Design a protein around this ligand. Sequence first.
Ligand code: K
Ligand code: K
Ligand code: K
Ligand code: MG
Ligand code: MG
Ligand code: MG
Ligand code: MG
Ligand code: MG
Ligand code: MG
Ligand code: MG
Ligand code: MG
Ligand code: MG
Ligand code: MG
Ligand code: MG
Ligand code: MG
Ligand code: MG
Ligand code: MG
Ligand code: MG
Ligand code: MG
Ligand code: MG
Ligand code: MG
Ligand code: MG
Ligand code: MG
Ligand code: MG
Ligand code: MG
Ligand code: MG
Ligand code: MG
Ligand code: MG
Ligand code: MG
Ligand code: MG
Ligand code: MG
Ligand code: MG
Ligand code: MG
Ligand code: MG
Ligand code: MG
Ligand code: ZN
Lengths: 85, 116, 89, 94, 104, 52, 143, 33
Amino acid sequence: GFFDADLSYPTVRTERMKHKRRRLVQGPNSYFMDVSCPRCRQVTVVYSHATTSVECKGCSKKLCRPTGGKALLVEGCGYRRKPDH
Amino acid sequence: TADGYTMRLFVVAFTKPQANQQSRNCYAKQRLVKWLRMRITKMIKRRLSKVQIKEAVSLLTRNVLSDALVRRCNPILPLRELRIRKVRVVRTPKFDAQALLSAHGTIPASVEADQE
Amino acid sequence: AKRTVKMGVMGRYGTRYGANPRKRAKKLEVSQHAKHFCSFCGKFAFRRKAVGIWRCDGCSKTVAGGAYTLSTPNNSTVRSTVRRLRELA
Amino acid sequence: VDTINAKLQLVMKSGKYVLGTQQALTTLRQGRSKLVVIANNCPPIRRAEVEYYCTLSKTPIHHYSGNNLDLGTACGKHFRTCVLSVTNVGDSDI
Amino acid sequence: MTTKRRNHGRSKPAHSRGRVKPIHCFNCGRLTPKDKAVGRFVVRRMLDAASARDVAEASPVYGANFPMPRLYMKQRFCIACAIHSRTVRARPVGNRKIRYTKKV
Amino acid sequence: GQITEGCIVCNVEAKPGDRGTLARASGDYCIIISHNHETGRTRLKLPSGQKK
Amino acid sequence: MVRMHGNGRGKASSALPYRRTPPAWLKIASRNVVKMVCKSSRKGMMPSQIGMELRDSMGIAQVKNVTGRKILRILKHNGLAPEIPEDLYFLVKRATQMRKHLERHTTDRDTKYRLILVESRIHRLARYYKRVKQLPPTWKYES
Amino acid sequence: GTVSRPRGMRPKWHKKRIKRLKLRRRRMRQRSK
RNA sequence: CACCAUGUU
RNA sequence: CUCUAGGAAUGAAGGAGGGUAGUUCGGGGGAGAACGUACUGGGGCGUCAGAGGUGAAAUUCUUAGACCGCACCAAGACGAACUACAGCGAAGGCAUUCUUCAAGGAUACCUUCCUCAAUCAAGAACCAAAGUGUGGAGAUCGAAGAUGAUUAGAAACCAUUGUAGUCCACACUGCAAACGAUGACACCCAUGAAUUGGGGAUACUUAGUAUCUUUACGGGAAUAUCCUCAGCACGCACGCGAAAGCUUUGAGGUUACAGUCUCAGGGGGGAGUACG
Ligand SMILES: [K+]
Ligand SMILES: [K+]
Ligand SMILES: [K+]
Ligand SMILES: [Mg+2]
Ligand SMILES: [Mg+2]
Ligand SMILES: [Mg+2]
Ligand SMILES: [Mg+2]
Ligand SMILES: [Mg+2]
Ligand SMILES: [Mg+2]
Ligand SMILES: [Mg+2]
Ligand SMILES: [Mg+2]
Ligand SMILES: [Mg+2]
Ligand SMILES: [Mg+2]
Ligand SMILES: [Mg+2]
Ligand SMILES: [Mg+2]
Ligand SMILES: [Mg+2]
Ligand SMILES: [Mg+2]
Ligand SMILES: [Mg+2]
Ligand SMILES: [Mg+2]
Ligand SMILES: [Mg+2]
Ligand SMILES: [Mg+2]
Ligand SMILES: [Mg+2]
Ligand SMILES: [Mg+2]
Ligand SMILES: [Mg+2]
Ligand SMILES: [Mg+2]
Ligand SMILES: [Mg+2]
Ligand SMILES: [Mg+2]
Ligand SMILES: [Mg+2]
Ligand SMILES: [Mg+2]
Ligand SMILES: [Mg+2]
Ligand SMILES: [Mg+2]
Ligand SMILES: [Mg+2]
Ligand SMILES: [Mg+2]
Ligand SMILES: [Mg+2]
Ligand SMILES: [Mg+2]
Ligand SMILES: [Zn+2]
């Protein structure tokens, strides 16, 4: 025997694979990271799916490259997902 | 070429499936096809414009140009086979007897006029 | 109110000369009396002053081109070819 | 070109400008001009005279890609303009 | 009348494309849409086994190591021409849906 | 001899120095076909379609 | 875009979070966000652009969740709203660029067809804006 | 055979007959008005 | 792949 | 010390519209310049008695050199193989390369906005081929016509030709088995193997994984596994249907008959004819 799937309380397996607007309650896929300057050690918040190119406010060069999905972070910079809330 | 020869080259390339590929086709994206065409055009133009017609003929007969083309184009697109299908001289410079002599080196003798 | 249904400036001919010859002449008659854009001075002030002669009211420039229009379609292509052949040298 | 048109729209709404050759030359004479824009169908003698004033006053000069009709449209006007002179940039960062 | 084939005898689904440019039949030259024509790619030997062995004896180039050239040609037929030449035959109603994806 | 292949020309001199005798009527022109540097001659297509 | 003039059925969009409160690490005060919104508008950015720069480089996922007001509402309170609504501005801009292209390419029949759809969209949009008094009455789009 | 029983001549050629007949009647009324 | 038209209610 | 009317507004629809991005995706559209063999013709260089064509022939071409052979020249079409139950387009339609100009869709987004929508008389635009007008062009094929066959007859099928056409520009025409013979929008809906484009990953509290190329459109490209949105589909569970068949692509969820709008039909002919 196997556990039948409750519609009100789906298992984490099935809900994880779902599209963001196909979940039981829709929500974002994106997040913000703390990006330190590759040669400045200045931390600027960068959107995960940023499409406008982001500068380091003191470094004044590119931090990420826009793509069709998640932004491509510049080489040799530290980052960490800021908590969703 | 360097000695005033105009050559039209025709290169044909074919995509190939990868070793572990299970797809029913290996059609290439048009972006990569145009990139492959541009790289082939640049390499052939750069390699052949600074050489003479005699050296260019050697580059084409011993497949030195073809080997370098398939080596530098495979990273763009996995290629089953890259081949120079046709080479044609379309414009020649004015005739030069000394240039023809230097391209022939030691001309072998002919015995056709000689008595049998 | 609109004064004629089909013919415009051709209404001066009355019932003479036939409908098809009138229609063919109407297209050129309208264009030869119209205001054409002046590439100089950026105005719509080019008027025909004889066959092939166009004088702009705005800037008083005189241009030779076209029996009934300022620039023939053949001239537009010829202008492009000449500029293309000029850049090739 | 869209970039110059975008900044021209900003000047039209925030900065100060003058339209016409005679008024633009006046601004150049008193050194109040920040930028001069000339249409591509300006008469060659008038274009050279405005250019000489810009060189003497060290005023930046921009050659517009359209004619005086296009330049007038880009400023939100219904009339042509051969020369435009900017005396205050507003927030256009020109 | 009754629909004989869900395919309607071609390879053009209802919302794939509007028009496929026709081709001339290999035999008679009838114009038939390229997706509908019966297409065979045939590799043909220039000479039969008896003739190939005779030409190979007199050939210093062709022999056991160097194969003789073959004929390569894509042949597209009209429906009537393909039935007459027996490249394709009428099939029982059940077997009509059998499709082959490679030369066998 | 200074004009490229395919250039459209008018007021063409049939003989050098005749001050223009070909392609002079309204809307008419000649098309340059080729030059031959060996004999110093230029080939053109006349408005009537003849080649000269 | 999708379900008007073209039978496209795309579903790409954003999915706003259920939790509306700003994250605890956002240290920018509400009055400072309003300052950035107005300063951005004065540089010539439209509300869609303004919200993207704050999202991309400033960590502000939603200006409304921080200040209680939307981007366009903030601009209207500061006299910085566009004279024409932004979506109508871009539709009118596209129609102008397509008509200018059609001046030289008179045989581009596909572009002509697309222009009919764009101008049909403008008039439907202008009717709505005239009804909600966001545009002057007798405002007209002209070619 | 691709269509069902027509009960008459080929409809396309029946259409051509009607078109030819309509043209003839049109000209006949021209020479009476 | 020459030529094979017709059959009173 | 100076100013101080400025934060109190349902929410952002797995409804619509805009925005930004990969400078994404594609036989989508327009412009320019080139390229490719082939058909036909033309000389040049060779050869000599036939060639062509058919079931068999003949009309036809040919020692005034046909056919055939080689390299070329001109002109107009066309874009083979790759080419697929593949892609793009509202449909009609769309297939060489490069350079260009406006668009279009999908996807991505914690950007914007706030019912702006669905479907339609009237009205408007587009619409294969043939056909029409005026200019071009005229290689190929080819209504009409000519000639040769076949036949009882054959002004048909077959052969040799050939006009209008076929191609382009501009302006008309608005008909197609313009078909999925299936109107548009929305909801639900079982299974297996694929495919096109874009992304993500490498009645339970969380469950894997690689390969190849790799000095510049290159922090690259293609693959493998899994997931996802959108698109054309295949073999196939309910249910439906007079049946053939249809089936997340309905023709299912309908006598247990009601989501919304719209078009058309009422035995066969006369007839899509007459009249206006
Ligand atoms: K019988
Ligand atoms: K001969
Ligand atoms: K019709
Ligand atoms: Mg593939
Ligand atoms: Mg499609
Ligand atoms: Mg069709
Ligand atoms: Mg078939
Ligand atoms: Mg609608
Ligand atoms: Mg039958
Ligand atoms: Mg049947
Ligand atoms: Mg029927
Ligand atoms: Mg009948
Ligand atoms: Mg009888
Ligand atoms: Mg919404
Ligand atoms: Mg293009
Ligand atoms: Mg020949
Ligand atoms: Mg010959
Ligand atoms: Mg091809
Ligand atoms: Mg036609
Ligand atoms: Mg004609
Ligand atoms: Mg008989
Ligand atoms: Mg008889
Ligand atoms: Mg006969
Ligand atoms: Mg007879
Ligand atoms: Mg005959
Ligand atoms: Mg006779
Ligand atoms: Mg109909
Ligand atoms: Mg059909
Ligand atoms: Mg359909
Ligand atoms: Mg119907
Ligand atoms: Mg329909
Ligand atoms: Mg796709
Ligand atoms: Mg996929
Ligand atoms: Mg009912
Ligand atoms: Mg009835
Ligand atoms: Zn003027």
